[PDB]
């Protein structure tokens, strides 16, 4: 310490300094004084390397670094010792991560481009405000900017520093980050549409447009530390409110007449300037909408050619009246949609010529049509405008017209259609009748008349049209659809739409239309009849049943159109009407059901022993109709009382059995009964029946149990009771035969919705099907009374019956539903191959352990080969803990909270507890929690801030039964209250529908009220007003609730956050202030493809809005916004907002719109460097979405939007499913099963095969059923291995084999998968050992011939004339002098060859040695022995590489020259040496392949070229490199297992390998590239899918 | 191991030191019988053309060495194996 304070105590002394840091070498402030000396003497003298040893000799960088160090090295470095010192030094300290990227920080605030190359060389990643915003802030070189963008840095920060440079004033950086912002060279394009620049000049787009030290001192200190004019430019979302500045003759007007598409949509302008316009001279493309324009310019058409103009949301004014004195005929489409019009152009005729479309739909043009004297015109729109009258002469000079449309106008008649006229759209106009000039077209495919007044409709006699493709007449007024003239000149139909139509009956001739593919007939209200003709029909396969009451019975699953198909058409083959009902006879115990039934059987055969399970038994009537009905004996105790609701169905008719032993009281016990049969058969009919009248007298009978009967259990919540009797259910007698009577006549006049079901037709299949079940039931076993699938199978083989599997799941539910058999359709049970005939036993031996018997009471565990399934009804039909004898008495319970202030509180007050509704119910609602349940509740609790106690509590004076539901205020009682209330709510519409039924007669109890309280003064108040959720939610305007007097108030969300959107994690609610939105036809997007979405404003931005309608069900609003809660992802679309108001549903808007669209119109923006993008970010969704557990339905082409056209963004597509066909998995399509997502990875290799083709399959629009097509064959499309490859592996017929989606991302993430265009196979056992190019493009290989673009199979050169050597030598050319050696070498230069005993042939005879040429002057090498010439034919250099023996071994040193590749530095490859050698061209003086290769296998070079260095391996593994610090880039290990020459070709790089095979694999020149691009493109996601978390 | 090293550069004294002490390949592609006597091999040497290194070799995705000898066109090198 001594030298250190003498040093310090003694400054400005060079020489004490030098003894001082001598001395150093020979402790946190000592390096103050050593970096005090050395920034002292940074450059006074060269004295460093003494404190370059000592700082060598030397936690001790950390603080140097600290102790500002750096300044001095960066001093010093702005002498080979001392520069190797340096190096060294630096390559030392910057070991460390954080020191580098502390000196990287504290170099960039300078300006300096010699240490920062330096240190980005040797690492300091740009990711650590940012690093490029600081650079940007200080007006820094453009050198230090440019060098940052060539570095790994983030996209958003280079948006970032964009604005803060825009805020400044500058070029150089502001074109520097456009360009790495947009700039699309491959695609000849600029992406400039996202951003938000306030202003464009031509400085910025300037450099745009297409027209050493550092890395030597980065090697040396990494040494020592190991030891075509571009056309596309888009400026939308631009705010440009002016664009004249681009408008002048800068240097970039002569560089802008090769545009050829303009795009400034979603902008602020006024007018195009006028010299723009004329100095555009080549575009055909332009678009401008959504700007606020106020007239036509008039000279727009004045360029050369145009076409595709495009101003469709600005407000021109009323008259748009073009110039006549322009007669431009290249237009072709004239978009004017959506402005302020009144009139149509005036001199449309005269200034163009050849438009095609010409689109006004949305204008106000209200006066009547010109004669419109267009000759080529194709498509007219005129949609939502107010016409009055068309103009006789409106369509005579059109005779080319297609696709007139005229929707919401208000027309009368039409004039004169053009014989040529193919598709009308007249959609929601006034029309009384269909015109005759309609009627008199010949060519008619596509008319829609919706929403119209049509009374008559002709049939297909008055229709000269032979070519109707399709009809729409939906919510028309039509009675008669006269079909019997002629019908089948209809027969090409497809569509045929009358929903909303006042029909009767189907006419018996629509079965001849057989090309009908939809026929929608819906809401009609009177038909209640589907002829039997509509079996030859199989074409269609949608058709909408809604409100028609049909006597089919319907099926959940087992419903499908073309199974209603194919059941009328079994319907036609013979149709016998049907005799079955069910009469299940329900009551309490000892109230005589069995008995009664007993001698209604006339049975004598026969103490009953109470009544376990359901005793299903059948019974035939004798009248003279068959009639059999099946009874069920219902057991009467209170614990069989969960499983009745399941074995009570509306097509039936039941019963109800007093006691009248003990009279007006068990009159009273059939309340429970009749309110559960009101609940679940709202229609159905009950028959009262008095059981006791030998021991009860006439006091009894007259009691009001027969006049309460007529008083109170008549009517008020009850159903429609027919008739009562008082029968003495021991004996036959009067009563009784009374009793059956009326049990008969009932049956016989059911009428469920006037239709007779006791009496329906139905094909005698399904009868056949019944006698064969019945008379099979005998022969099963008696344990097992089931059949399995194979023996119903077996059985319908057997017999005469003609259903195949199609029918089986529709003729299995009818007879489930008839109730001979159950049938369990569900594809989740361990049961749905098992069919249960007999279901008498079935019920039998369920409902065993509820009549048979440390822990509280109801709760068991396994105890006494099917049992293992057995269970699983058992949790399937509420029975296992067991709800039944689950303590009835409530258990203690203790609340955490009850102050009045922070529990949330929701009353259920129903008249009675339907059967089994808790035992549904506490099975429904279940970090573990804590819970104890009993009969009538649960009270699930997790934590003192989280728990839920629903139960039932009941009040004084108060016969009814209340259902409470307690939670804490948080969020999470909150979420919890929410989850409860959405449970409960589906449990009683789906399961008792009665509760939820408004009763049109009488009044609007509901029968259901649904309090909520809420309570004024917080705490001890002890009184919480009621109120009826749906009066507080008529109070949706406000989120403040008041009494009568405003002094106080309370917010909704604490009294019921259930209404307000408050029950979900993140708090989703917009201040309507914030938000812009208006609904109207101007902002629908996409024209209503994508249902109720809007555009809108948001926080500034722009959205789209989906806007829900008016049926304030507030279910699925919730039921979407639960799911987008936790779904964070780049490729997931994002939540935004969600509010009540309107109830909408703000999400991010893609401006490039769907994918759909954007194939289907811009296929020339598809490049091969997109569509794989567009896969990954799906593929990357897929993945995410199944990562969780959820499943997508269908992906398709519609499903996906694009967010951007740049190639190189963080985010191009994301998924979308909106609410409210071909792209079907062969898995579900074809059978029934539950979804999974392999159907998902089946979308997705479909979608995949959309995008691969240009258009795909969907451009043809027919009928689209392991048959797909090879693409390549017939589509057009460009080879794509490893994506055909991937095509067919996610089209495989087994789903269990496609890969999972966390796999195919993998597949697809490879940039060997972009950059690879053919990989020609050629025939078995040919050798070729050298190739040649000929550029169509063509290889000619050693002299056989190969097509690039045909594949046809038929040393080496290449003048259209080819030079070959053989082996013996005998050298010969094909559009010469035998050598004494073999011809080793050829290349073509103004030609040398080679020989093998050593001499060189020019076409000079010269001999050097004792046969490899190369370029770049020249070079090459014969032997062991390199050299190097040039014109002069001269050794200019000599270098032997057998020198090269200190480092490798005499093995590769020794051997022969093979190849070398020569820039600025010789690389020279030798025979088995997998060490290449590196010579330099001045000092006359290691790559290691086989150490690359351990780092990822022969390692024997054997070919190399340059372009990024590519060396062919003898294993076959391609090595790549780049000529900056050798470092690996990737090892491509290719098929070929060998190869043998690979050369560049026109930009394409040709391999050839030996697999014998031979295989030609054509790789892309941009692949260096694309191996890092890629990888830090998929970085840069990756943190973005973790930021979302 | 310096022993590689002596082999490949065929020093008979080094190589016999190390040996001495206490690379087949090696000594095959430098074609040194010292090297060989003292210490696949077959392929190597039928490939670079050395008689008695393969004919020592034979008294004491990689194919039989005959396969190359053909390929490398050594008459002699391809009869003597042919003929074992
Ligand atoms: C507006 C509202 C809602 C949505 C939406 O999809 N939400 C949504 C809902 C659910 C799911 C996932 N469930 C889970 C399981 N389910 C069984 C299946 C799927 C997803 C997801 F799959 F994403 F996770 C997204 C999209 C838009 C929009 C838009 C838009 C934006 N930009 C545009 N430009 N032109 C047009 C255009 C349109
Ligand atoms: N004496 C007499 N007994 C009756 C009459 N009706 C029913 N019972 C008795 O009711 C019992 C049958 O009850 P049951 O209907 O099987 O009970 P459930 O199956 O649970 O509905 C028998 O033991 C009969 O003795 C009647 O009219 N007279």
Redesign the pocket.
Known sequence: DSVLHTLQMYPDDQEIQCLGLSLIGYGHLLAKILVSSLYRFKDVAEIQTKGFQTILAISFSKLLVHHSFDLVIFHQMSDQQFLNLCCKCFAKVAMDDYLKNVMLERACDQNNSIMVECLLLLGADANQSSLICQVCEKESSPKLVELLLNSGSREQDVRKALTISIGKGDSQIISLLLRRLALDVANNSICLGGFCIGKVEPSWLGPLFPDNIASTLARMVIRYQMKEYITSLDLSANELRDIDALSQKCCISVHLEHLEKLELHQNALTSFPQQLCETLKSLTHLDLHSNKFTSFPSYLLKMSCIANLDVSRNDIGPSVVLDPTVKCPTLKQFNLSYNQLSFVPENLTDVVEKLEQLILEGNKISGICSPLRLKELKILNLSKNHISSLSENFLEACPKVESFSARMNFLAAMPFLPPSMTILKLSQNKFSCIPEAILNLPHLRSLDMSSNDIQYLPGPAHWKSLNLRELLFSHNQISILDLSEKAYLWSRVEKLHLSHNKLKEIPPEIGCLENLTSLDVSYNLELRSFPNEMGKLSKIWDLPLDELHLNFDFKHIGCKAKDIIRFLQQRLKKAVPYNRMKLMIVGNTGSGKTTLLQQLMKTKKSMQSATVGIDVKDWPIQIRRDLVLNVWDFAGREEFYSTHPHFMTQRALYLAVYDLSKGQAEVDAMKPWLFNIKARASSSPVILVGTHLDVSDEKQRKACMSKITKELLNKRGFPAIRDYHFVNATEESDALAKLRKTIINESLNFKIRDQLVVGQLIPDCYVELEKIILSERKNVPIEFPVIDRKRLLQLVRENQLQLDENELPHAVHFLNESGVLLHFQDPALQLSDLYFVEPKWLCKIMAQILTVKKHPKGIISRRDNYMSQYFKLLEKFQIALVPSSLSDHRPVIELPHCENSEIIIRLYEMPYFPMGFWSRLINRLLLRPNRMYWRQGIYLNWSPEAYCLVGSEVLDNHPESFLKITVPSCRKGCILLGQVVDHIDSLMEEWFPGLLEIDICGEGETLLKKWALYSFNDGEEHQKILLDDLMKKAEEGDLLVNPDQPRLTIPISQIAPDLILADLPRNIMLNNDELEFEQAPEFL??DGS?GS?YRAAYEGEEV?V?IFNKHTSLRLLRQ?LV??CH?HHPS??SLLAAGIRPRM?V????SK??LDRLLQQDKASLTRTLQHRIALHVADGLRY?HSAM????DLKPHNV?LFTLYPNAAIIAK????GTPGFRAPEVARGNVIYNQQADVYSFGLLLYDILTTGGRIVEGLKFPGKLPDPVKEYGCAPWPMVEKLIKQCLKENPQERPTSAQVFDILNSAELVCLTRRILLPKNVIVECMVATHNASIWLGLSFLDLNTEGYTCLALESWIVSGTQSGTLLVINLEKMTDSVTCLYCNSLLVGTADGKLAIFKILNIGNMCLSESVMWGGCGTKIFSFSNDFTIQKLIETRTSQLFSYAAFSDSNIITVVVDTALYIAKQNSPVVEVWDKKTEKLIDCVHFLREVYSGRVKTLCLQALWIGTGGGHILLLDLSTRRLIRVIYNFCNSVRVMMTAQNVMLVLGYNIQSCLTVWDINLPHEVQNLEKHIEVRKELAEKMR | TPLHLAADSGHLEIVEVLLKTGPLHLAAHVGHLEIVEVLTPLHLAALYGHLEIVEVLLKHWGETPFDLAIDNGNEDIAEVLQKA
């Open positions: 997007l996409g994508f979405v789209a989906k979407e799911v987008l779904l997931l679309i549903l999400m991010e808007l893609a719109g769907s979405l959820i499943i997508y339905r939007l998924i979308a499913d909106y």
